[PDB]
Ligand binder design. Structure first.
Ligand SMILES: NC(=O)c1ccc[n+]([C@@H]2O[C@H](COP(=O)([O-])OP(=O)(O)OC[C@H]3O[C@@H](n4cnc5c(N)ncnc54)[C@H](OP(=O)(O)O)[C@@H]3O)[C@@H](O)[C@H]2O)c1
Ligand SMILES: NC(=O)c1ccc[n+]([C@@H]2O[C@H](COP(=O)([O-])OP(=O)(O)OC[C@H]3O[C@@H](n4cnc5c(N)ncnc54)[C@H](OP(=O)(O)O)[C@@H]3O)[C@@H](O)[C@H]2O)c1
Ligand SMILES: O=C(O)CC[C@H](N[C@@H](CCN[C@@H](Cc1cnc[nH]1)C(=O)O)C(=O)O)C(=O)O
Ligand SMILES: O=C(O)CC[C@H](N[C@@H](CCN[C@@H](Cc1cnc[nH]1)C(=O)O)C(=O)O)C(=O)O
Lengths: 425, 425
């Protein structure tokens, strides 16, 4: 049912996906990776006999396996009409560009396009770039279902998965789509539970980083760490002054969740119970910190209780409460995830890490889209402004000539308009 | 003047107080401590020429000094009518025993008696135990004004002070009492502001330990650590599962503060703003964690907001947010105070540590007193019952034969009746 599968963007995600596809059963496996150093390293490794190699860490060792790459391309114009399924394993900010760059008028054999990390509107954005009469079904996965990295860029096709998510969601541009079940089974081989939902936006609306990264890593504290050069980087999930979590950040989280939930309703998607989603889909805590009744009742609890509960959740996860205690009674320091910070690239230009650049770009699109539904998203706009002000001051200080253009101002209104047009179609 | 001053109890508190008294000066300084291993070590140290030594830790190093003791008694029979001021540095739950045991027939010259760590009703209880026609004024200090420990009990006269309160409160059984100003000056020598209040109970209602230890260390989690032998002891101010602080513990804190505040009103004393008291008088946090407007408005904020704010306060103090950051951006682990646990005494009998035996005995007396004001104090009673159940099960398991009688049910009603009769006189 998968046929021959083309992986677009041959990185960590694609290597995990490739092994899951091979466990399930598929035809030929191809990849498209745009030009660059990574593609050069891949092409030499393949010439020397390399295959895609996945290692599962620790209790995920059973994931480990090898898979042959049958075809490798860098240039979309060079694709033959030999692919039934495309899997987009590139950054989600690149989905539109990827789709616009493919020669769809001679890819009539493509039946399915899977978006692995679909933001709100991604399915619609992708469909707006397809030619009229294109028969491809577009699938939206709520987020990548694991934690995977290419360990060593010198062995470019060897990836390590260190964790697998509990649950993700899958929606389709085709009503009551059958490709959902096939991909539900494929990804279930990794241990993740895939929950099919009735529309793409219902799955896109269950992208966790939209709700968590936006309030915490677009605020003043996080940006000060991220843009800093000297001193310790600070910690992503600790409380102030060690990390960015404050009652104000939790208030931003609640208000943004309200804003996102109303957008989802206006797009025809049921929103989520934030506290239950975080506890049950991501990381749980004990009943004495978050009682089950408080978790299940969160959406009706009232703003003060909701903020208290969210603050309790993140305080309860400063350590992993289910980890073994050490001889001193301490639990694993779960919150001590260091901030990645700005770094100069090979051209000497300052670049931002994916946290927060990808998070800012996603939220900028969501706000622009929401405007079409007559939703102002003031909390979201405040977070966008915080990022923009901080990055602008960094450019002022370092000099535009020293900064990569991804730091410069963007405009998401054209993509938002394309999404809205597609949705009204 | 203070005249000649007799310290009753010569432990960590007494050593700090002795330093402050010697700075102020002008009297003989004596001490009385009941017989036992500590008194034996004290007499040995003094006989070899030792003096009282107070060291300040870190920021408090400026306080460090030495204080000479003129006389030390471990036999009240040797006391004569030489003393104008008595300073009770014994545990607050022993005040009644200690006042009954003093040789009052040879102490007719005593003009003032200071309770260094009072609690609601302590002044009245002590006055009820004085001989008829005794005209010593009794002073109640709200809380001991520092954190002080005897470092090494083989050097019983050397103490370490690691914290000093910003503010404490002082009441007197004499209206418009002039001794309050004297003690204001004495304590000011170590940097503490003493605020005189118009009655003893107003000061006693500002005993910090009563508000904090009752909800946190009479609960299930704390008692399980305290009555354990084998585990790691856990930490007094950490969140579950490393420590006892949970939203339920915070709810108990809020509800007890309400109950205690009503008792204070019925005794003609103004209650406190719990959050402002904790932040401003004891240990502060940053405005981004506790905004000044939230602190000042706490008493009118409503139960949900009050509980959220108290939780945030204790989560913000898991580290000392004003301590210097280390190389990795971490602050001092302020909450890592280990629980002291049960231990066998020199007769082989299990004894409870002062946390929570002293805290239980204080709250039991307060509840018994409140019944005379027709206040049931259900939250306080739930905390008493939690302690009683846990200790009862420990006796069940270990055997009554093996337990010191201090672990057994007590009757606070006689002392509460004496307090109430004294108040009504
Ligand atoms: N655990 C995870 O790995 C994880 C988890 C959650 C979310 N995500 C997100 O998933 C996305 C991919 O993650 P990843 O870890 O697989 O990244 P990766 O290892 O760097 O792989 C991305 C691959 O796609 C190539 N690429 C980028 N843009 C392309 C384009 N327009 N057309 C063709 N190829 C393109 C990249 O080549 P170049 O390097 O030359 O650009 C690279 O080979 C990222 O946005 C990531 O933030 C990943
Ligand atoms: N930072 C602090 O130290 C601190 C903090 C908060 C509150 N407090 C309050 O201050 C009180 C004393 O604290 P501390 O640290 O000075 O204790 P400590 O170092 O143990 O000294 C207490 C002194 O009183 C004697 N004592 C104990 N129980 C007695 C009893 N039933 N009858 C007669 N004498 C007794 C003790 O001698 P033996 O050891 O021989 O009995 C010792 O000399 C605490 O109980 C508490 O009410 C102190
Ligand atoms: O967030 C990062 O960039 C890297 C950590 C990453 N986060 C998840 C979102 C959920 N984050 C936890 C908090 C937490 C995770 N680890 C310590 N604390 C929460 O919000 O409940 C993601 O990105 O999808 C992961 O869990 O692997
Ligand atoms: O045993 C220690 O070191 C502490 C001893 C002592 N405790 C006070 C109660 C207040 N406790 C702090 C919280 C805290 C203190 N130290 C770490 N956290 C708070 O509730 O605001 C007492 O016993 O009355 C002191 O702080 O002086």
């Amino acid at each position: 049912s998968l046929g021959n599968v083309l992986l677009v963007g041959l990185g960590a995600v694609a290597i995990q996906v490739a092994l899951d596809l091979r466990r399930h059963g598929a035809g030929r496996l191809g990849a498209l990776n745009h030009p660059g150093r990574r593609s050069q390293r891949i092409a030499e490794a393949l010439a020397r006999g390399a295959c895609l190699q996945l290692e599962g860490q620790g209790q995920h060792r059973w994931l480990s396996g090898n898979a042959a790459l049958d075809v490798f391309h860098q240039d979309p114009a060079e694709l033959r009409d030999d692919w039934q399924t495309l899997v987009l394993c590139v950054p989600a900010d690149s989905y539109l560009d990827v789709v616009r760059g493919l020669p769809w008028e001679r890819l009539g054999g493509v039946r399915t396009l899977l978006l692995v990390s679909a933001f709100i509107g991604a399915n619609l954005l992708v469909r707006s770039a397809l030619p009229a009469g294109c028969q491809a079904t577009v699938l939206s996965l709520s987020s990548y279902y694991a934690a995977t990295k290419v360990i060593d860029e010198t062995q470019p096709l060897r990836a390590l998965t260190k964790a697998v998510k509990r649950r993700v969601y899958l929606g389709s541009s085709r009503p009551d789509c059958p490709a959902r079940e096939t991909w539900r089974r494929v990804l279930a081989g990794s241990g993740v539970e895939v929950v099919p939902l009735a529309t793409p936006e219902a799955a896109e609306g269950r992208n966790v980083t939209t709700y968590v990264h936006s309030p915490f890593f677009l605020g003043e504290f996080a940006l000060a760490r991220i843009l800093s050069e000297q001193g310790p980087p600070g910690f992503m999930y600790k409380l102030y002054p060690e990390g960015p979590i404050t009652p104000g950040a939790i208030g931003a989280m609640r208000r943004l969740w309200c804003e996102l939930s109303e957008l989802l309703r206006r797009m025809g998607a049921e929103p989520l119970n934030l506290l239950r989603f975080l506890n049950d889909d991501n990381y749980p805590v004990h009943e004495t910190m978050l009682p089950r009744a408080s978790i299940d009742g969160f959406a009706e609890a009232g703003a003060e209780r909701q903020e208290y509960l969210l603050f309790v959740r993140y305080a309860a996860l400063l350590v992993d409460p289910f980890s073994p205690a050490d001889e001193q009674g301490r639990h694993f320091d779960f919150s001590a995830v260091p901030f990645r910070r700005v770094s100069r690239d090979e051209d000497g230009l300052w670049r931002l890490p994916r946290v927060p650049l990808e998070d800012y770009r996603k939220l900028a699109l969501i706000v622009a889209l929401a405007a079409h539904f007559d939703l102002a998203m003031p909390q979201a706009r405040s977070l966008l402004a915080s990022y923009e002000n901080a990055v602008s001051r960094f450019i002022d200080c370092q000099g535009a000539s020293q900064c990569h253009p991804s730091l410069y101002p963007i405009d998401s209104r054209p993509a938002a308009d394309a999404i809205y047009r597609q949705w009204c179609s």
